Structures are given as C-alpha cells and as structure tokens.
Fold Aac(3)-IIIb protein.
Amino acid sequence: SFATRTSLAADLAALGLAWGDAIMVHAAVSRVGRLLDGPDTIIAALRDTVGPGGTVLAYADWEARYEDLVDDAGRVPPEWREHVPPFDPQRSRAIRDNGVLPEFLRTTPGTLRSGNPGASLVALGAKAEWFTADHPLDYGYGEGSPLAKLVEAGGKVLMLGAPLDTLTLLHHAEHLADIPGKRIKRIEVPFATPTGTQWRMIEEFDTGDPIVAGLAEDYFAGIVTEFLASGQGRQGLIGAAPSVLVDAAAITAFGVTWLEKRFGT
Amino acid sequence: SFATRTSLAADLAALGLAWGDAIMVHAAVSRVGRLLDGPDTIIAALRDTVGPGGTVLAYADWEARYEDLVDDAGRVPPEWREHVPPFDPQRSRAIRDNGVLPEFLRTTPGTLRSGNPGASLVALGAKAEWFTADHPLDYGYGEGSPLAKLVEAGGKVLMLGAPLDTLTLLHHAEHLADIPGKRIKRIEVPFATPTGTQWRMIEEFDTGDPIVAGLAEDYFAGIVTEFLASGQGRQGLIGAAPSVLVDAAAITAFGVTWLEKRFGT
Ligand SMILES: NC[C@@H]1O[C@H](O[C@H]2[C@@H](O)[C@H](O[C@@H]3[C@@H](O)[C@H](N)C[C@H](N)[C@H]3O[C@H]3O[C@H](CN)[C@@H](O)[C@H](O)[C@H]3N)O[C@@H]2CO)[C@H](N)[C@@H](O)[C@@H]1O
Ligand SMILES: NC[C@@H]1O[C@H](O[C@H]2[C@@H](O)[C@H](O[C@@H]3[C@@H](O)[C@H](N)C[C@H](N)[C@H]3O[C@H]3O[C@H](CN)[C@@H](O)[C@H](O)[C@H]3N)O[C@@H]2CO)[C@H](N)[C@@H](O)[C@@H]1O
C-alpha cells in the first residue's frame, strides 16, 4: 500500500531505464499511487536508477500570467511593464499546468535551469551544466536547445502516467519538420540582469497549438501511439501508473517523418 | 484585474504591517485574487513592507505520510524503517494541507527552516537565524520554540484569507495554558545526520486535536473572533482577501486566558 524509493527504482529498471541514462520525465504523480515522500520519491528513484553518471530532466517552462495583457505585436503596455515579474532562471517558478514534479525537481538542491523562459528545462546530474547552458532565446525548441542536446546524447523520455500529448520533445520534431504553414508566436519577455530589468522579443514556432492547421490539439498522443504500435519503445507500470519509455532520438525522427508525410514534400 | 507586488504591499501597510516587523503568514492564495507572479507576489510584498530589518515567517511542518504505519507506542515497524524518508531541514518539503505558501517560502533563496520536523517554521529575513536556531525537539510548541521567539520579539501574525482555525501560534497558547487533561502525542521520527539515519522519539502536546476534551476542532476560530470583537487586532482586505492581523504576544496571552477560564483554576 506504499510505493517506495526502492520499489519505484525496481519498476524503472524493469521498464528499461538504465545506468547512466539521461532521462526526461513527464509525470502524473496522483496515478503513481500512495508515495512515502510524495513526488520526491519519484525523483529519488530516478536518480538511483541512472546513478551519478546519469541525468534527470523535466520541462520547467515559466509561470508568466502576463500573456493576457499583450496586444497584437506581443509587447507589454507601458502601464504594466514594471509590474510584470522578470524572469530569473534560479528563482522563476516552473509552470504547474502539467503536474508539480518539474517544480519539485527545480527546487531539488543541485538542479540547474536553462535560460529560455518558456522553453526552459531543469536538469539534475552529471550533464546538467551542458543540458542547460547557452539556451538560444529565439526558437528555443530547435538546434541549440536542451531538447536537441537530449537527442544528441542518446537520452530517453518517460511518460510516467502523464497524457501522451504532453511530450515536450515532439515540439523539437515540429521545429525540425520541413513542412509549410508553420505557425509562429511572438512575445516580449522581461529578463532579470545584474543591472535591472531588460526586455526582449522572443520568436519561436508556436507550441501552444499544433504547428500547422488541420491537426487535433492532442495529436501528439496519436504519434506516440503509432510509435509504440510500430514495436518501438517500452510500456509498463511505474508504481500503479501505466508508463511509457521512448528513445529521444527515435521518437524525434519518428515525429518529423510523421509530419513530413502528411504535410509538405 | 491584477493584484501586483506594489498593490499588495500597499494593502499590507494599510492593514497595519510595519517596517521592521517579524510577520508570520497564513494564506489562502486563491482568495487573494489573480496575481501576476502567483504566491511569490505575496512573499515579495511582505518583504517590501517589512524591509531588510523585518522577517517573514510561515508554518512549514513536514510531509511525512508514515504516521499511518505506527502501532500504539509511536514507533515504526522494522519492515518500514529504512523506507521512511528521514527528515532533512534543508530538503524536507513543507506540508501543503493549509496552502502552498509555506513551501514557496521554504524554497525562496535565503529562507531557513528549523529543526523540529512537525513544528518547523520557515523564516526569511533579518532574524531568520535566531528564529530557526536550536528548536527543541520535545514539546516543539513551547518555551524554546520559534513561536515563543515570535512572541518575545513582538512579532505579528497575518491571516491572509486563511480560515481562522489554522493559526499555529495558538498551539503555543495551548502549551502554556495551565489546565488539566492535556492530551499528548508520541511518535518516532527519522533524522538525517552526516552518518546515516538516526531515529528518535518525539513528545509534545497533541496539536492534531484540541488540547483538552470538550472543544470543537475549529475552536481556534472562535478565540480569534472574540479577540477581534474585543477591539484588538485589525481587519481589512489584502488584494481581494478578507485578512486579519494580530499581535503575537497579545493573541497568545488572550489564548491562554481563554483556556484557563473555561478549564482548570
Ligand atoms: N490550445 C489553444 C491555444 O492555446 C494557447 O495557449 C496555450 C499555451 O500558452 C500553452 O501551451 C503550452 C506551451 O506554452 C508550452 N510551450 C508547451 C506545452 N506543450 C503547451 O501546453 C499545451 O499543449 C499540450 C499539447 N501539445 C497540452 O497537453 C497542454 O495541456 C496544453 N496546455 O497552454 C495554453 C492552452 O493550451 C493560446 N491560448 C492560443 O494559441 C490557443 O487558445
Ligand atoms: N482532527 C482529528 C484528529 O486529527 C489527527 O491528525 C491530524 C494531524 O495529523 C494534523 O493536525 C495538524 C497538526 O499535525 C499540526 N501540528 C498543527 C495543525 N494545526 C493541525 O492541523 C489540523 O488542525 C487545525 C485546527 N487547529 C485545522 O485547521 C487543520 O485543518 C487540521 N489539519 O491533521 C490531521 C487531521 O486534522 C489524528 N488523525 C487524530 O488525532 C484525529 O483524527
């Protein structure tokens, strides 16, 4: 009646998580079952399974409710500017729309957070410095991004009971997909610098909706389902949670090909 | 349509919070209204109002779900011992039963947390070291406790939209009250030391229920209501939240006298 740090690490090993892996986690903590330490049991079991050579990652994003006040060019009206809290990678809370684990991971001692606010990842472990260094502010889901570094390092993504449409790495596949009609989001973001608040415009492919028209908003779940149905990845229980584990480079290439087949040439 | 760091500090000043105050906060963040930075706007406004000479405090407690496995002497059965996460004052999460603000305060850079797990307070500011140092493990709501140091320093308690029965300092009044039939809670707690897990028995007056029989479980709210009805304390809005501000030494003495009149001699 209690999933422990030991039992969860055993479930993670049986699922496919290995010593030295860089693992990115999307979790629905309620579905794991009753935990002795709450979400920190999940974090501890992941660190135990990958060892000091591994790295645990999560999608942090940023809690910035000021997006309801921007006009049409994405800037902030002058009456609201100095009221918007600027982004500090060490103090800005992770978004909690898709669960509380990224914030729990962000506040775990040793965790590093990248510089692109809306696309920030948290990393804890051996390669946390490289995974979070020099995050390009424009198109933060693309070439120089932590999501690209996860693919390059041969990392893995674990859907720990979370809905399959929340896989952030598939936004990296959307950025890479050579297709037409890609939607773009522009917004101004306040940054905290040792001299005050400095504003800056951010450009990236819009990850608030499907990258192109004609797709259901949860269509990431279909891509993951087809990926598993093709005999790739592994499925199994983590505690009481139905979980999915995929290779980062494989699911990205599968996601790009999924898009380049139905759209473009 | 947006309570800001500036507007909240103005509401706090109008309520009675002053420069240099040591303020302990019980908050219901949802009732404050729409915040630009979430709960961190409340923390920032409190720090702004009290200044670098002040101190912001909250009741942290401890997220320890292992209390359902103890027998009748309060110890942990041998099969569960090494599975229970030990208490680390720097890493143990604050309880979130009465809101998320204590955990947000605990993870704010610079905040210190005291050593008594179940009675731990978080402190951020000038006297955070003294407020959290040398917390007596047995009877942690009594003489050497942060709640007693708050009374000694002339601190204040702010009920920021929270229910009035959640005022932790009234447990210090229960400990001090010279009355009969005081209930006692005993439990064993794992502690993290630089050499491993060390277990220890904790004794204190039971704060999970009224200190004596014959009291409704929310009777703290009646004491606060009588205290305000007697012309003491101040009431007003903090954002959109009906709030209460009281002097720590006054509400404690009023709480003790409230108990010593209806019970004992
Ligand atoms: N969905 C409709 C659209 O949502 C936008 O805002 C959305 C946006 O801020 C935000 O979208 C966020 C992005 O930020 C972030 N960079 C990646 C993350 N996957 C995404 O999340 C969203 O897309 C996922 C599906 N991949 C869903 O599983 C998830 O529940 C959903 N919140 O959530 C809001 C609602 O989804 C705009 N309101 C408007 O373009 C339109 O209303
Ligand atoms: N209430 C019934 C009793 O609750 C106990 O457990 C309780 C205990 O762990 C815990 O009680 C906690 C204490 O820890 C902590 N040290 C101080 C805090 N004010 C108190 O909180 C409790 O008392 C307040 C009223 N002052 C309420 O406002 C609050 O909602 C309530 N959770 O919440 C649990 C439920 O209240 C035991 N289950 C049993 O003795 C009996 O069932």
